[PDB]
Structure 1
Amino acid sequence: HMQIIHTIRELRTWRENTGKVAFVPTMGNLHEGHLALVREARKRADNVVVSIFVNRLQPRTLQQDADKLAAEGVAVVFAPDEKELYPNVEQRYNVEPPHLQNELCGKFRPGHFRGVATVVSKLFNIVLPDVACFGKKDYQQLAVIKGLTEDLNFDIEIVPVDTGRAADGLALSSRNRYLSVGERAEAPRLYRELQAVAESLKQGGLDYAGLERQAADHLTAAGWLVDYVEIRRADTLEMARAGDKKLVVLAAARLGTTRLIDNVEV
């Protein structure tokens, strides 16, 4: 049944003489939001590879992770150590995103999306998948991966998966475990404020900047420390232009020291 491959060589040996492969890269500490990716992967290929890797370029629960994936019919858990993927100290050749890497979440995480684009390219060249699933909660990550896939001619179908949420709307994330009881009760307001922006856009709203500030002002007045609220073009995160019909609203804000992100496509 399920197999745990730790080397590039063993992964490739398994993958040759296998048909269609759907691939889900993760960093472990798996939760229900990740399984939405795995379940969608299994609906697009019989053989699903889930990688678990923590990337020094961008909380180990290995046994509990693999049991959850086993019950979802995953074929291979690829969990290499750091030296397997980075045999030298440095990563000399990096996949360099455009200026997007310094916007939104990238502004306070320099080097982060470069590290995501590089490790995902490495994983792509290791697993050689036909389909790869990524969650929409990390929308900017998704744009970067779609972009590198196109620009580097990776023959891989990128499948966005919808954000799994709690009953009150909060996007599922391992970050949510940091919230105190008080902050967790307040955390659903992020998605509430994004939805009301999407409704204003649905009801013919034209002032992008006005809507972003209002949501930001509501969060700040309720105790949040807002990093950004931004309306951008869906999928690509290109600048929103007046008259665009495929939009997305994104925000990042801190309750205490925990930074939460969410988004709504309008």
Structure 2
Amino acid sequence: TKLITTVKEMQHIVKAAKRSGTTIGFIPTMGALHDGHLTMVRESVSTNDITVVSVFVNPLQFGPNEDFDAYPRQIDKDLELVSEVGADIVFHPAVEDMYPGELGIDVKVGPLADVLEGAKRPGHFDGVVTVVNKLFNIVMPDYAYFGKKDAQQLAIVEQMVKDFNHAVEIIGIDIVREADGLAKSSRNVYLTEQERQEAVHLSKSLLLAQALYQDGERQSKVIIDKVTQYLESHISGRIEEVAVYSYPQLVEQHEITGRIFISLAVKFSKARLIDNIIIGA
């Protein structure tokens, strides 16, 4: 399983793939890989002739007082993990190769980034679309795999593909969880023993929101209050968001109709975790 560390060689490999009719699946990551990423890699290896995983800690999607320096890095272990699952290439470019000085053209997300995590993390999704756009032009995949844990990111990337006419098909994969329900995340390693036990209540609060909805609740305020109160009595973390928005349109709902997602953001000591559930037709 090949570690490719320059844009030029990645391009060369891709061009040769196209010429031979080799289909390409692509899983963009920031490394520190876990079973959530491997689930995407597994699906790609089933569907496509070659599978490329990028590991690139993208500085543009980290803001002030976030965790860019602390972000776990373990490229050898990452390469081993995806090798075991049948991946062909790990694409791991230098920051300077991806960003050789200042960008002359700027890519910015509109209304989809004015709410939720786009409001909580100013410029974050601008950073994501910037790097994903570049990676799609480098790897030229037939399919690109993303996780529904970052539901807002998924909707934004799908819009970008539409807006830019990228030939790539986006596949969103269901949230992969620990046995106790905790959503898999490279940032889970930042959790202390006790926070890890508390963090399971994010997922439990979403099952609570789902039951409330199942039993006929449609007032977002009631769901949000019941979820918030539940989290408050079970976790030491700061509850940054509990929200009910249409999906994938991302417009705040007051009285619930249509397809929605109920989303959470919680700040523990160092770990900032998110989770969601998508409900309705």
Report the TM-score, using the length of structure 1 for normalisation: 0.93
Task: Say whether residues 1:216 and 2:228 are aligned partners.
Answer: yes
User: Does structure 2 conserve the Cα–Cα contact (< 8 Å) formed by 1:198 and 1:265?
Assistant: no
Deviation digits for residues 196-255 of structure 1 (CA, Å, limit 9, x no counterpart): 112222222110122112211221233331111111223332333745232211111123
Hey, what's the Cα distance between the residues in 1 that align with 2:210 and 2:237? 20
User: Deviation at 1:141?
Assistant: 1.2
Corresponding residue number in structure 1 for 2:77: 64
* Amino acid of the structure 2 residue aligned with 1:136: K
**Aligned counterpart for 1:75 among listed residues 73, 83, 88:** 88
Corresponding residue number in structure 1 for 2:133: 121
Task: Say whether residues 1:27 and 2:27 are aligned partners.
Answer: no
* Amino acid of the structure 2 residue aligned with 1:45: N
User: Does structure 2 conserve the Cα–Cα contact (< 8 Å) formed by 1:219 and 1:225?
Assistant: no
Hey, what's the Cα distance between the residues in 1 that align with 2:270 and 2:6? 37
Deviates more, 1:170-179 or 1:242-251: 242-251
Corresponding residue number in structure 1 for 2:66: none
Report the TM-score, using the length of structure 2 for normalisation: 0.89
User: Does structure 1 conserve the Cα–Cα contact (< 8 Å) formed by 2:206 and 2:276?
Assistant: yes
Deviates more, 1:127-136 or 1:242-251: 242-251
Corresponding residue number in structure 1 for 2:273: 260
For residues 15-164 of structure 1, the aligned pairs below 5 Å read: 15-18=14-17, 19-58=22-61, 59-88=72-101, 90-164=102-176
Hey, what's the Cα distance between the residues in 2 that align with 1:94 and 1:251? 30
Q: Segments of 4+ in structure 1 off by > 6 A? A: none
User: Deviation at 1:92?
Assistant: 2.8
User: Deviation at 1:99?
Assistant: 2.7
SS of aligned partner of 1:28: coil
Paired residues in the alignment total 264
Over aligned residue pairs, what C-alpha RMSD do you find? 1.6
Hey, what's the Cα distance between the residues in 2 that align with 1:126 and 1:203? 48
Hey, what's the Cα distance between the residues in 1 that align with 2:271 and 2:4? 34
Task: Say whether residues 1:230 and 2:243 are aligned partners.
Answer: yes
SS of aligned partner of 1:160: strand
User: Does structure 2 conserve the Cα–Cα contact (< 8 Å) formed by 1:40 and 1:161?
Assistant: no
Deviates more, 1:103-112 or 1:184-193: 103-112
Hey, what's the Cα distance between the residues in 1 that align with 2:233 and 2:205? 12
Hey, what's the Cα distance between the residues in 2 that align with 1:153 and 1:217? 44
State percent identity of aligned pairs. Answer: 38
User: Does structure 1 conserve the Cα–Cα contact (< 8 Å) formed by 2:35 and 2:176?
Assistant: yes
